[PDB]
Amino acid sequence: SGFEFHGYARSGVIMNDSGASTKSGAYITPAGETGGAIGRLGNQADTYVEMNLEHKQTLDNGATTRFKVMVADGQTSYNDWTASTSDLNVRQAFVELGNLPTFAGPFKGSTLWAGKRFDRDNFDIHWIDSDVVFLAGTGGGIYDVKWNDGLRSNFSLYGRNFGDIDDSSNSVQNYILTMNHFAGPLQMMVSGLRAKDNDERKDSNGNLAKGDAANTGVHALLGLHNDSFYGLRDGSSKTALLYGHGLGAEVKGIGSDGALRPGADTWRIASYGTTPLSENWSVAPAMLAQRSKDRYADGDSYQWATFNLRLIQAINQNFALAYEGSYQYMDLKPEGYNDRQAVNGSFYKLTFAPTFKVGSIGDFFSRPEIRFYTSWMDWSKKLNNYASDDALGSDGFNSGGEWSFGVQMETWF
Amino acid sequence: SGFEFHGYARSGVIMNDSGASTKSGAYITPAGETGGAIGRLGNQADTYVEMNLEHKQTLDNGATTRFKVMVADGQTSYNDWTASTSDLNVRQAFVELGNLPTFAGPFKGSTLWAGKRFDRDNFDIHWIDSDVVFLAGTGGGIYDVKWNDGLRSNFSLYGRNFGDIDDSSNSVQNYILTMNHFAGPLQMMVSGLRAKDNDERKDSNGNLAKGDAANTGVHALLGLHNDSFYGLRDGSSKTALLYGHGLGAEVKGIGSDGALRPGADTWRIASYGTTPLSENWSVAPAMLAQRSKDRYADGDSYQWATFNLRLIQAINQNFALAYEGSYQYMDLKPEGYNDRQAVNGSFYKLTFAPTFKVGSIGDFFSRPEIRFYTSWMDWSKKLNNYASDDALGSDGFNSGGEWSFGVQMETWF
Amino acid sequence: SGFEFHGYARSGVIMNDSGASTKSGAYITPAGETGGAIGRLGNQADTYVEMNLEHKQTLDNGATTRFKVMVADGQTSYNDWTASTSDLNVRQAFVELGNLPTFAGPFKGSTLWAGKRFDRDNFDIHWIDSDVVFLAGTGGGIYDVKWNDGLRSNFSLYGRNFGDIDDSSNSVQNYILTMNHFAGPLQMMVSGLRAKDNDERKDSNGNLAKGDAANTGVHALLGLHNDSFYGLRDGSSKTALLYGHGLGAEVKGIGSDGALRPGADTWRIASYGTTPLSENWSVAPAMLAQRSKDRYADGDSYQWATFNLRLIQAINQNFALAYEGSYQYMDLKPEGYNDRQAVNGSFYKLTFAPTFKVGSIGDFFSRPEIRFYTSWMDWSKKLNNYASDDALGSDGFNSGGEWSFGVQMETWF
Ligand SMILES: OC[C@H]1O[C@@](CO)(O[C@H]2O[C@H](CO)[C@@H](O)[C@H](O)[C@H]2O)[C@@H](O)[C@@H]1O
Ligand SMILES: OC[C@H]1O[C@@](CO)(O[C@H]2O[C@H](CO)[C@@H](O)[C@H](O)[C@H]2O)[C@@H](O)[C@@H]1O
Ligand SMILES: OC[C@H]1O[C@@](CO)(O[C@H]2O[C@H](CO)[C@@H](O)[C@H](O)[C@H]2O)[C@@H](O)[C@@H]1O
Ligand SMILES: OC[C@H]1O[C@@](CO)(O[C@H]2O[C@H](CO)[C@@H](O)[C@H](O)[C@H]2O)[C@@H](O)[C@@H]1O
Ligand SMILES: OC[C@H]1O[C@@](CO)(O[C@H]2O[C@H](CO)[C@@H](O)[C@H](O)[C@H]2O)[C@@H](O)[C@@H]1O
Ligand SMILES: OC[C@H]1O[C@@](CO)(O[C@H]2O[C@H](CO)[C@@H](O)[C@H](O)[C@H]2O)[C@@H](O)[C@@H]1O
Ligand SMILES: [Ca+2]
Ligand SMILES: [Ca+2]
Ligand SMILES: [Ca+2]
């Protein structure tokens, strides 16, 4: 065949009760810095776009060829001309050679790839704008090596960079070796990471950028992909247990954190489900919790847990009422790192969003959708103290209740 | 259906009688700073490109779905690699849900939209590179609410930003509420603008960026869309009378000027027509005049009137001779704002441009076209004094007559 | 017709025997600064992408219409988000009017164009990532003016810029006039270049950027396009003899070098061939040699010669073994320019690269291909002294043997 255009786009407005700007984002809480994402409905004011241009090809012998480029940009500005603050950048550029006649045995229907890409098998928890696992970078590998006709595996090498790619003395390559095995509903992912002399990166001045930074890492994922809402109702669900040590201590963006100590230790649990309550109501609960010790400073600790609950109610074939509630508890002990002060407390979010679409309302993933919304946000005052250049506690976002309103669209195809 | 690729692109060269650079642009005159556009033929040396990638969709029930992104860049450099000066940026990203089976009554054939976009109903005077009205930003709204079967209306909320989107104390959101009514050839547009605490934006130093800047504004447009050359000959024409106060004092780019005073008052007239003189000649006159008082400085005044005249002459089915004459009078009293000195005088432009195309020559909008040209420009010497970093009066562009030559292409599809 | 998406994309990884970064690139040798490219197989660690979006159109009368934009970006970073270092930029934007019913005689099937583009008739030596001739910029022209039914010619005007396009006193336009004639396998190209007052460009401080820089230039290309491997075996081959003086002294990127002296004199020879040794082996030898005197400093001299040899061996219908050997000699006498020290010596490169593809292996240009590789590089220690911020001699790339490994994809469609 030929060309295909795919992509994602969110774009909207959010204002407080006075018709002016406020803070918003799935990562605005102090916990957000270590991955503590909260509900995103009516809580995203940026114009984010991803453009996927593809060149597919099928040969008569069954062999496939595929090329894809991803160009992305994310703007907080509402203006029609954002050249000065543009973030337009090529995120992906890779080729896939699939179903080769020459590959036999366990390599029968396997697909070889190379270039810069997001791993095909990454997966996320949509309502919280957080990936469960996100393996990206530049490299190569093979998908779907079928063993015994009931155990498939992926093997790959992904390369990333740490520090300033322009400053040779403050730049390091981080490599990741990963084997991903799938056996029915079960998934076992194991990665080995390594960035030689990461601890010896000198900044522009001549001093050590870190000194106690890790040079290696280990990462693992244990996942369960169900075809029912946790086995008790129609729907679907996914549960994943993540573990990381050293450079592997950042369990979502694998190999994306160059500041982790050798002893940085992380455990994380991601879980969510989709289930129809009635021919008009659908519910999707999700939880993300993490425990990270000795991450950036000796003796530090970052603990938080997010609970998100999205509910849609079909009224028409085109109109639905969506609701979202987020709850997050956090206890962060930064030990002076980044001028952060130890903090603990909770964050809450309530959103009511009338939604229009043409697709199946009971489907959380049917996308052309336009929504109007209102949110209420509150939190323990102590969280204001985590940072001084933070969102919580800045000018006009420190009181108890904060109200926001807006309109936005979101799609993918 | 699926994917659609649409766009615009102009690109070419302009040199003076010595084979070296000169000044060019529809906005080069002192009047240009307040909107005083002049003829653009042979007067645009940049490579400007707009790329529109769309994903349209039609459901069996008549409902439509549409997503569009616009990526643009504008370069003055003639080089094949402009990475260092690139202005590539996402101008638009929106979705439209049209003709929903669930929308009845006045909402019958209406289309709902959200995201970042240029209003569907903006319209321009092409030969002068000036929109009559340009509503753009991020928001949402609805098009074509049919009342009594002879009165359609559009309602919407558009959001924009003033100042540095990165500097929190020098950054403000400006919101625009607008109702646009159409009744046959008549159009009545009304907008309310509001940017809370615009007057309190402190620059990076700590001082007020303005102090006497407006926080609100009002804007109106009275348009007449004819199906004849001003009712006296075959063709078409449009006339619009624009008025603005406060933040609405910038009558073209609505909500785009954050330095306007509360008492800034502006009146503007836009008018043009298209008419075939014979089966081989076509003429298009256009006029843009403006009166703006107390705009940026107390007691200031900007007045100017542009007269453009584009003539084409079919010689073949592929060759045409195009001519353009521009005349502009201006009287500007800046009262010391920006180091500008009060000035008054006139500007002239004559352009002869052999043109090649495949489309209908009598049509001013059939686009694939390549043109060669020569231009002569002259103006009142006094205009050289408006500014010191101006175009008129810079090194090599201060004498009486100024000749230019070049080639350029222009399209849209 | 409508839309066409075409492009090029290379993307991969290169690491040394310690799993860390190394130097790589077809232009890393001291000779590279004056065009001395070496083998590129397994010697390109960047993610370079070119996206070509086109809008073609054919009218019933045979007349064609074509619009093309090329958007490119090149990153050395392996990361999935390169907004901070993005080089995304519009490289081309042009229109072509082909086969006009009105064009008769020698203009019969000729094609008119204008805008920013790379000349349709540029051609390169692929394995060494070097164009033989590269005419690009902004202008207009005509392709295929048929004389006597055995002599075709292209005539064109190309515009380029020297210096900082933003700094008016350090900015100059360089214009190129070129006539390119083809008579069977023979090609004769002649260009006149001129940048008025190039020698008078004052940098930001107020001093002359150069002072002894050239204002004009001359360029000539003599080429032979064969339908056999140098007339002794099946295949193909091309040989070109290039000459340049003054501004024409940079014989590849015509009009792209603003620092050349008036007496800069350059001779270059490019030649390569393609030939199948057997139904499984294919060989492609290539040579690039250059002699450049009085280039940037009076009495300077840059001489070098690159010999590249690519060999592929089909093992399957999808698996091939590719080998590449590069040899380069250089004798450079910079005469103090840029802090370079006169140097002489040779560079060697051996690369073994198992390659996967679906297309014709014996075809060096069939593209979807994924390769794994290992390279060995060594050079005369003296070359380390050419510059201090060079690649040869930097930290960890100064010893004798340097090994590298990696995987990468490369395509075009
Ligand atoms: O359809 C798969 C494809 O969609 C993207 C957006 O282009 O992700 C969106 O859709 C997913 C469902 O398949 C959601 O889980 C996700 O949150 C949403 O952004 C791609 O990332 C994915 O490849
Ligand atoms: O799939 C792309 C990739 O983008 C990230 C940012 O790294 O998230 C953006 O794109 C998603 C598309 O699926 C959106 O759902 C998300 O809202 C947006 O921020 C990744 O999380 C995702 O893997
Ligand atoms: O065809 C409508 C579409 O064309 C654009 C360029 O993409 O505007 C061009 O064509 C108009 C005629 O429809 C001209 O009036 C205008 O000056 C010209 O740039 C778009 O702006 C418009 O949506
Ligand atoms: O339509 C896009 C929008 O771009 C502006 C700049 O804001 O003008 C550019 O794009 C036009 C496309 O119609 C071109 O005709 C014009 O020459 C170019 O500068 C607006 O005026 C226009 O509405
Ligand atoms: O196929 C022509 C077209 O391909 C490009 C890449 O898009 O060049 C590639 O293919 C050429 C063979 O036709 C190679 O010689 C060249 O090295 C390779 O990059 C374009 O440059 C060319 O227009
Ligand atoms: O064809 C585009 C043009 O790009 C240059 C850089 O000016 O080279 C890049 O693009 C080529 C596409 O054919 C690639 O083959 C090449 O590897 C890449 O660096 C020119 O050499 C080429 O003419
Ligand atoms: Ca805070
Ligand atoms: Ca001046
Ligand atoms: Ca060196």
Description of the molecule:
The structure is a homotrimer of 413-residue chains. By secondary structure, the first copy, chain A, is mainly beta. Chain A has one domain: Maltoporin, Chain A. Chain A is 0% helix and 55% strand. Chain A contains no helices and 21 strands. Chain A has an 18-stranded antiparallel β-barrel. Chain A has a two-stranded antiparallel sheet with strand order 7-8. In chain A, a hairpin with a 3-residue loop joins strand 9 (136-147) and strand 10 (151-163). The two termini of chain A are 18 Å apart. Chains in contact: A-B, A-C, B-C. Chains A and B meet through strand 1, strand 3, strand 20 and strand 21 of A and strand 3, strand 4, strand 5, strand 6 and strand 9 of B. Bound molecules: a molecule of 2 linked components (GLC-FRU) (6 copies) and calcium ion (3 copies). One calcium ion (CA) binds next to loops of chain C. Chains A, B, C: Homotrimer. Chains A, B, C: This is Sucrose porin. Chains A, B, C: Its main location: membrane. Chains A, B, C: One of its GO terms (molecular function) is carbohydrate transmembrane transporter activity. Chains A, B, C: Porin for sucrose uptake.
